[PDB]
Amino acid sequence: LTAPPKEAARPTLMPRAQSYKDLTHLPAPTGKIFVSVYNIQDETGQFKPYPASNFSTAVPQSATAMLVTALKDSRWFIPLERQGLQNLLNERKIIRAAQENGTVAINNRIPLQSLTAANIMVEGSIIGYESNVKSGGVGARYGIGADTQYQLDQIAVNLRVVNVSTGEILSSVNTSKTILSYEVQAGVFRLEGEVGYTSNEPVMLCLMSAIETGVIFLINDGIDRGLWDLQNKAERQNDILVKYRHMS
Amino acid sequence: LTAPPKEAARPTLMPRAQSYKDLTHLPAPTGKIFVSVYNIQDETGQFKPYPASNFSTAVPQSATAMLVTALKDSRWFIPLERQGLQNLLNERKIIRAAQENGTVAINNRIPLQSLTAANIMVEGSIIGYESNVKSGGVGARYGIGADTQYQLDQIAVNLRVVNVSTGEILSSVNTSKTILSYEVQAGVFRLEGEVGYTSNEPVMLCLMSAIETGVIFLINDGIDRGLWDLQNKAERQNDILVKYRHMS
Amino acid sequence: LTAPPKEAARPTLMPRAQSYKDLTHLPAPTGKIFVSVYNIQDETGQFKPYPASNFSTAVPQSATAMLVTALKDSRWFIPLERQGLQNLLNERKIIRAAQENGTVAINNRIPLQSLTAANIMVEGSIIGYESNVKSGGVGARYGIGADTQYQLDQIAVNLRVVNVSTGEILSSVNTSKTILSYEVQAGVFLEGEVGYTSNEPVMLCLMSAIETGVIFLINDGIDRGLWDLQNKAERQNDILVKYRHMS
Amino acid sequence: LTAPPKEAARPTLMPRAQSYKDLTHLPAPTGKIFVSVYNIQDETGQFKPYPASNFSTAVPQSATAMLVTALKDSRWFIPLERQGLQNLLNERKIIRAAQENGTVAINNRIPLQSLTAANIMVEGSIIGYESNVKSGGVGARYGIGADTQYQLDQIAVNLRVVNVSTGEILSSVNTSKTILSYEVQAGVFRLEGEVGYTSNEPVMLCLMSAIETGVIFLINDGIDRGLWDLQNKAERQNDILVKYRHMS
Amino acid sequence: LTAPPKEAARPTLMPRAQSYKDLTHLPAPTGKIFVSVYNIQDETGQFKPYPASNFSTAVPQSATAMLVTALKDSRWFIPLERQGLQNLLNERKIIRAAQENGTVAINNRIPLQSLTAANIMVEGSIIGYESNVKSGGVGARYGIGADTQYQLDQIAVNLRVVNVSTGEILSSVNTSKTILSYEVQAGVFLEGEVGYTSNEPVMLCLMSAIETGVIFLINDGIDRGLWDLQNKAERQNDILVKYRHMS
Amino acid sequence: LTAPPKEAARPTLMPRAQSYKDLTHLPAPTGKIFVSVYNIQDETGQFKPYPASNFSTAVPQSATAMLVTALKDSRWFIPLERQGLQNLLNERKIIRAAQENGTVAINNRIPLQSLTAANIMVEGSIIGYESNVKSGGVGARYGIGADTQYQLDQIAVNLRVVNVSTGEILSSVNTSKTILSYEVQAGVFLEGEVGYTSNEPVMLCLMSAIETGVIFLINDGIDRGLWDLQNKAERQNDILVKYRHMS
Amino acid sequence: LTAPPKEAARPTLMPRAQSYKDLTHLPAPTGKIFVSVYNIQDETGQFKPYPASNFSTAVPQSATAMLVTALKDSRWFIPLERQGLQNLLNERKIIRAAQENGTVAINNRIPLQSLTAANIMVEGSIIGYESNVKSGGVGARYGIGADTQYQLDQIAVNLRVVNVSTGEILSSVNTSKTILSYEVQAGVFLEGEVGYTSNEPVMLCLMSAIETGVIFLINDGIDRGLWDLQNKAERQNDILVKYRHMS
Amino acid sequence: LTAPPKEAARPTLMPRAQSYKDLTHLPAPTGKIFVSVYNIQDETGQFKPYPASNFSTAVPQSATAMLVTALKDSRWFIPLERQGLQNLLNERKIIRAAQENGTVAINNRIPLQSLTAANIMVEGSIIGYESNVKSGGVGARYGIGADTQYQLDQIAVNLRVVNVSTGEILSSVNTSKTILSYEVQAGVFRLEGEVGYTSNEPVMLCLMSAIETGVIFLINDGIDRGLWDLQNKAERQNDILVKYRHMS
Numbered sequence A, B, D, H: 001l002t003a004p005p006k007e008a009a010r011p012t013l014m015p016r017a018q019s020y021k022d023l024t025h026l027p028a029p030t031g032k033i034f035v036s037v038y039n040i041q042d043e044t045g046q047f048k049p050y051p052a053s054n055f056s057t058a059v060p061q062s063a064t065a066m067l068v069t070a071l072k073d074s075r076w077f078i079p080l081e082r083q084g085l086q087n088l089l090n091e092r093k094i095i096r097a098a099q100e101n102g103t104v105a106i107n108n109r110i111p112l113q114s115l116t117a118a119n120i121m122v123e124g125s126i127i128g129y130e131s132n133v134k135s136g137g138v139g140a141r142y143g144i145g146a147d148t149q150y151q152l153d154q155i156a157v158n159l160r161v162v163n164v165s166t167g168e169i170l171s172s173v174n175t176s177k178t179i180l181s182y183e184v185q186a187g188v189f190r191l192e193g194e195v196g197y198t199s200n201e202p203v204m205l206c207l208m209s210a211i212e213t214g215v216i217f218l219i220n221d222g223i224d225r226g227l228w229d230l231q232n233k234a235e236r237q238n239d240i241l242v243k244y245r246h247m248s
Numbered sequence C, E, F, G: 001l002t003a004p005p006k007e008a009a010r011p012t013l014m015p016r017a018q019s020y021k022d023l024t025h026l027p028a029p030t031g032k033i034f035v036s037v038y039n040i041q042d043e044t045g046q047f048k049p050y051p052a053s054n055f056s057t058a059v060p061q062s063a064t065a066m067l068v069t070a071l072k073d074s075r076w077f078i079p080l081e082r083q084g085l086q087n088l089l090n091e092r093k094i095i096r097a098a099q100e101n102g103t104v105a106i107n108n109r110i111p112l113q114s115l116t117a118a119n120i121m122v123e124g125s126i127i128g129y130e131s132n133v134k135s136g137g138v139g140a141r142y143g144i145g146a147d148t149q150y151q152l153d154q155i156a157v158n159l160r161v162v163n164v165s166t167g168e169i170l171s172s173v174n175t176s177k178t179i180l181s182y183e184v185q186a187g188v189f190l191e192g193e194v195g196y197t198s199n200e201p202v203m204l205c206l207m208s209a210i211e212t213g214v215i216f217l218i219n220d221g222i223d224r225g226l227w228d229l230q231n232k233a234e235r236q237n238d239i240l241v242k243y244r245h246m247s
Helices: A018-024 A063-073 A085-099 A203-225 A233-237 A239-247 B018-024 B063-073 B085-099 B203-225 B233-237 B239-247 C018-024 C063-073 C085-099 C202-224 C232-236 C238-246 D018-024 D063-073 D085-099 D203-225 D233-237 D239-247 E018-024 E063-073 E085-099 E202-224 E232-236 E238-246 F018-024 F063-073 F085-099 F202-224 F232-236 F238-246 G018-024 G063-073 G085-099 G202-224 G232-236 G238-246 H018-024 H063-073 H085-099 H203-225 H233-237 H239-247
Strands: A033-036 A077-080 A120-126 A134-141 A144-163 A169-189 A192-200 B033-036 B077-080 B120-141 B144-163 B169-189 B192-200 C033-037 C077-081 C120-141 C144-163 C169-188 C191-199 D033-037 D077-081 D120-141 D144-163 D169-189 D192-200 E033-037 E077-081 E120-141 E144-163 E169-188 E191-199 F033-036 F077-080 F120-141 F144-163 F169-188 F191-199 G033-037 G077-081 G120-141 G144-163 G169-188 G192-199 H033-037 H077-081 H120-141 H144-163 H169-189 H192-200
Touching: A018 A063, A018 A203, A018 A239, A063 A077, A063 A120, A063 A203, A063 B120, A063 B144, A063 B169, A077 B169, A085 B120, A120 A203, A144 A203, A169 A203, A203 A239, A203 B120, A203 B144, A233 A239, B018 B063, B018 B203, B018 B239, B063 B077, B063 B120, B063 B203, B063 C120, B063 C144, B063 C169, B077 C169, B085 C120, B120 B169, B120 B203, B144 B203, B169 B203, B203 B239, B203 C120, B203 C144, B233 B239, C018 C063, C018 C202, C018 C238, C033 C063, C063 C077, C063 C120, C063 C202, C063 D120, C063 D144, C063 D169, C077 D169, C085 D120, C120 C169, C120 C202, C144 C202, C169 C202, C202 C238, C202 D120, C202 D144, C232 C238, D018 D063, D018 D203, D018 D239, D033 D063, D063 D077, D063 D120, D063 D203, D063 E120, D063 E144, D063 E169, D077 E169, D085 E120, D120 D169, D120 D203, D144 D203, D169 D203, D203 D239, D203 E120, D233 D239, E018 E063, E018 E202, E018 E238, E033 E063, E063 E077, E063 E120, E063 E202, E063 F120, E063 F144, E063 F169, E077 F169, E085 F120, E120 E169, E120 E202, E144 E202, E169 E202, E202 E238, E202 F120, E202 F144, E232 E238, F018 F063, F018 F202, F018 F238, F063 F077, F063 F120, F063 F202, F063 G120, F063 G144, F063 G169, F077 G169, F085 G120, F120 F169, F120 F202, F144 F202, F169 F202, F191 G144, F202 F238, F202 G120, F202 G144, F232 F238, G018 G063, G018 G202, G018 G238, G033 G063, G063 G077, G063 G120, G063 G202, G063 H120, G063 H144, G063 H169, G077 H169, G085 H120, G120 G169, G120 G202, G144 G202, G169 G202, G202 G238, G202 H120, G232 G238, H018 H063, H018 H203, H018 H239, H033 H063, H063 H077, H063 H120, H063 H203, H120 H169, H120 H203, H144 H203, H169 H203, H203 H239, H233 H239
Parallel strands: A033 A077, A033 A120, B033 B077, B033 B120, C033 C077, C033 C120, D033 D077, D033 D120, E033 E077, E033 E120, F033 F077, F033 F120, G033 G077, G033 G120, H033 H077, H033 H120
Antiparallel strands: A120 A144, A134 A144, A144 A169, A169 A192, A192 B120, B120 B144, B144 B169, B169 B192, B192 C120, C120 C144, C144 C169, C169 C191, C191 D120, D120 D144, D144 D169, D169 D192, D192 E120, E120 E144, E144 E169, E169 E191, E191 F120, F120 F144, F144 F169, F169 F191, F191 G120, G120 G144, G144 G169, G169 G192, G192 H120, H120 H144, H144 H169, H169 H192
């Protein structure tokens, strides 16, 4: 017992909640749409307070990938790879250099085709993280005591569809989500005995949720405006679609 | 006794656990697949809090190599070397400069062949590390006392298969893993006597686990979608494959 | 007493332990293999806590050289110099500029030959240093008291053989090693106190783990038919079967 | 006494000890060897703790010059100046620009000759400085008391001979050295009276020592491997040479 | 008295001590030698501790100019200006631009010749500054008390003669010097307290050690036949045999 | 009242003391000499301790302009403007662009002349600022008490004359100066306290020391035959023999 | 009353005092002189101590604009805009691009003329800010108490006239000014306290000192025959003889 | 109440006071003058003290836009956009690229005209912000007590009219303004009870005020010097104009 500790808990796939369930069970379009995401920035401006590192950002710098993933899980869009475009072009250079002489083995040959191109691209930004937007606490001691304290933070996300052919923005949407934190404590004193518990929502998981939500609002907005069309016109009054229609 | 101390405990090869055991005992495909990994970034945005150095990242900057290693241990993929591509090209310059004159000794000669080229390349990102996502404690003193305290952190990883020939992302997956920490303490007072113990999961090792898990979900997903196929069709209902199928 | 203090303890050559002993007494191949190391990075991300300098890395930035050295001590590989390749090429410029006119003295002349070229090159990384991965302590006082406390840290290293002729990685290996620290202390209370503290060198753990990695790479290569033993009878070598067993 | 103070203690030449004595009294080769040192880096990664400046390195950045000096003192090698190569080439420009017209005075003329070129060049690194690798203390008080405390640190150095004509490393060596520190203290109490003394080894001096040692191991290794040869073959069993042979 | 304060003390020329006195009274060579100093770096790696600014170096960055000055005071070398070479070339551009048309007044005319060139150039480095290499203190109180405390630091310097015509280093030398500090203090306890503290200037120690180095370089060059003494009878000069003895 | 306060005390011209008085009353040469100063650096390496800003230098970065001013006040040298040479060349571009077409008004016309060029240029460096080189204090309390405390710092300057025509340094000089600080305090204990504290301006010491250096440079040049006095009878000038004596 | 508070005090034009009054009522020259100011730097090297931001300079970086303004207020000089020259050239590019086709409306047309060019340019530097150059305090308590404390700081400015046609500096001047601060306090002890504190604006001292410098420059130029007075009878002007007397 | 809090107070347009009122009710010229503002810098050199961020400037970096706005509100000047010139030239590139082929729809067509050019341009700087230039406090206690404290800070601004046709500065002006702060406080003790209030002037708003004032002084100065002329010469003795004339 000086070698390392062993794994506590298993790797699960990412715990997405309600937003995800809505996003997945969306009625499919007449064909999946080709989409590009280049970058969604942490335009928030915000870092963690003491005792965090000066450099610890308040929000993960991973929004871009979450958006591309949400655009895929919806089963409306095929995402074309542009976040790592440089590497993609490099592999293609190596391929073309490999097989240009027609020696490369017919089984091993990779057939190359122009890079599939998108019609609409969607970009956006993490547009604020305010911290302790609300907070409170209640405690009593009489020697026996308890108390809770809570804080909550905000996070907002812009997503927006841009038309490649024109540069007209075809849709802008602004979603928001609250991050909950709380601390429960109880202690008995005369003999001392204490129980304490604290829970923070993962900012990483709230970001993800809000991006999904945004993607839904984008699809619904595009349906209304005639960007894309449902397979079943009868499915216009889908529970999910009318729910997000109602939030507008 | 002012010269150095000698090694307490041995170098072991790196302690991988369950994810590994699943990843290795996966039923083999009809042939390997050629894969390229250029870079997986610490997109997390996060550093360690006081008293760590301001610059100590919360997560190791080593994900790329872990992925390549997991892709190899699975016995589904041959990884091609692109992380250090520049050096590879340099050694090949030196080779070609050596033997271009046909003086170099026939035993010593290195035969050069175009760089083996990948069909799918997989990239991803460490997409969040939230800290003390949960925490708690229980203690009593009566003069004799004990207490435990625990905290746990999150880490998530995106991996995604990109088709070189198109740019279509063929698969995105989002895995997550929890890092456990705890502190047990007991003391007797009258005469004082104290015992304490504290254990942290290695973030290092949780990252590695989660990347392995991701690789499995990628393979299984590819099997479903007809990217690649099994040697034994009878092995479709493999324990491992149905376990990850079930987690989707 | 403004003359300096003089050397307490002698320069020894660097105290390598078990990994080294295994690595040296390895059964030799049919010929030594030409290898290149360009760079092994401190991919760890980690610095020392207060009261260290903010900028003090947790791990030495010297892994590259340790690997080259380990590759040499094994007596399987000749390492070719690429870490300082630029200087090498510069000295070769100066040479060629010296003797191009055929005035340079025949005794002094340096004969120049194309740079010896490697077939496999091996790179890697320091993947991780986690700190106080475990820790503990036990202490009691009664006028008389004692206590020990211990902490231990982790370090891991990737090494991997890449084939120059294809880019195929021919082997990846992931080794790990634990750095031990402890503090023993006793006091009688007349007061009298004895204390002692010992830290493993992170330096020396890095070096150990890299040696271990080199062995696993050789053994792996033997299995996969990259290279072959002089004596096929020496396949069941104690060391080779020990590392075979760890796999 | 508001003008300055005058010099307490004198400039000596730099206090080298045992390593130096061994290095100097080495049996001479058949001819001195031409050597180049370009740079030996502080690959250690380490800075001083509080109360040092954040920027104070733990090790002096001066290893290069110490190695060149050690290579000279040995009376085996002529070091060719490459650390400041740029300035050398500049003075040679100024020379050539001076006397190209054949006006310059024959007494003043500087005759220029191609830059003397090395056959082997040796480079290396300061690999590691670990701090308080060991430590301890012993103290007792009875009105009268004393105590000592000690710490020691490690430092390691790679040197390696590279063959210019191939790039083959012809020798790698790894030397190490310990830096001692201690604090002695005594106090009498009833009347108080206290005496204290503290001594630190210079890290400066330990670095220098270890580099010398390395140079010896390099020469001895080269003798064995047939890089260079002794004037007197009878001097193979030299006390110093067999001492360093034994450490191998 | 809210305008400024007036001058306390006068500027003296810079208080050099023993090294200087030796360096000046050195027996002159057959002719002065032409020498170039480009740069001597603070290769020490060291800064001042709290409460100094983080950025205050432990050693002045001025060693280059000190060496040039020492090389001059010795009356063996003429130093050629290279530390500010760029400006020198600019002033020469402005000259040549002035008088190229032959209008410039003959009284005002500056005659130009391409730059005087050195044969040997000497470079070096501040190798190392260790701090509180030794320290101590003694104090007693009985109503009446006193105490002293002292610390001392080290500093070292490489200088080396390089031959322009080959790049061969013709001499390397390694000098060292200790910086003294002390604090005397007394109090009677009615309370009354007196204190005094003195630090050696690091500045001045650096300068001293560089001078010493220059001497060792000249003496070494005499031995090795770089340069020759006017009076061969002055080989056994007190100073020369003193530094010969230190070798 | 909450708009600003108005100015208390007047701008005086800059309070130079003894060095200045010596420098001005120097016997004039046969003609003034043309001189260039490009830059004199704060080669000191030193910043102010806590609570100063981390970035507050210990010495003003203004030495270059002080030296030029000193060189002018001496009435030996005409300084040519090189510190802001770039702007000078720009204004001259604007001039030439103005009047190249011969429309510009004859009253307004600026006649352009090649840039007057220097023969010797002098450069140097602030070599060193050591702090609390000495310090002390004396205090006594009996209900009634007083005390003083003093500290002093060092500052040194290299100046050197470089010959444009050759690059030979024609003179190097090394001047030094001490900065005084003190704190007087008295208190009666009813409590009542009076305090006062005075620091020499580091500014004003730097200036003084540069003037002194300029004098030593002129005197040295007189000896070495760089330049000559109008009245050879004035060789034994009080000032000149005073600085001759300090050498 | 959660929207903002309204303006307490009105914007006045900037409170300049004595220097200004002297500078304005100066007897006018035969014609105004054309001047260029490119840049006057904060060569001071100094920042504010804790609790100021580490980056707060001790002196405003604004000296250039102050100098230009002073040069204008004197009614001796027309300043030409060089501190934003790049924008000036841009607007002129836009103009020329507007009207080159001869469509632009005759009312709207901007007639372009070569950039008016200066004959002398003046540049300088904020040379030094020393802080608490002097300080003191006096306080007594008996239940009832009072105290004052004062500190004062120094600031110096170089200005110098440079001749465009030659690069000869035609005048250098070195002005200085003291910044006053004080804190008065009284308390009765029922407790009751009154306090007041007043600092001179460093801003305003800088401006005052630059004005003063401009006057010394004009007076110096009058003496040296750079420029001439309209009324030679006004040589003995009160202001001119006052500044003549300070020299 | 874990969603966000709602807006307390309405967005008003920006609360400008006396300077503004003077600036607006200025007698109009014979025609508006074309003006350019490129940049007015925070030449002040000053940051906020602890506990502000080290990087928080004392003065807003926004002076440029305030000056352009003041120049517009005066109804003497048309400001031409140069602060964002680059974007302006970019849009014009896109325009010219859009309609060069004469396909673009006649309704949609944008007619392009050379960039309107200025005759005078005015630039300046925030010259200084000194803090607590004055301060004071008065407090008295009897069980019951009160106190006030006040501080005030300074800010100055240079504006100057430069003639494009020459580079002659046609006017320089130097305005200044004081920022007021105070803290009133009262407490009763035996039972404790405390009331406090604190008011700071916005530095923002003082800057804006002072810039307006500067613009007026510039116009009045230009009227005197014959740069521009009043519509009604009878309006020379305007209340506002004679007020600012008097301040000169």
